[PDB]
Amino acid sequence: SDADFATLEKTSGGRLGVCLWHPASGARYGHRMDERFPMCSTVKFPLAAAILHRVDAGKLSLDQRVAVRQGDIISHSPFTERHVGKDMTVRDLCRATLIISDNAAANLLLPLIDGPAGLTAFLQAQGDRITVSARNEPELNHFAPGDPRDTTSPAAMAGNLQRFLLGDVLSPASRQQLADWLIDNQTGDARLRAGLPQGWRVGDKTGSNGQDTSNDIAALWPLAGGAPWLLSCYLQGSALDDDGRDGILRQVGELAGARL
Cβ-Cβ contacts under 8 Å for 145 (sequence gap 6 or more): none
The answer to whether residues 33 and 75 touch, using CB atoms and an 8 Å cutoff, is: no
**What DSSP character marks residue 143?**
-
* Dihedrals phi, psi of 28, to nearest 5 degrees: -150, 130
Nearest to 238 by CA among 42, 37, 31, 41: 37
Catalytic residue among 12, 41, 101, 133: 41
Tell me the three state secondary structure of residue 137. Answer: coil
What are the φ and ψ backbone dihedral angles of 65, each rounded to 5 degrees?
-105, 145
Active site residue 77: no
Rounded distance between C-alpha atoms, residue 97 and residue 48, angstroms: 8
Active site residues: 41
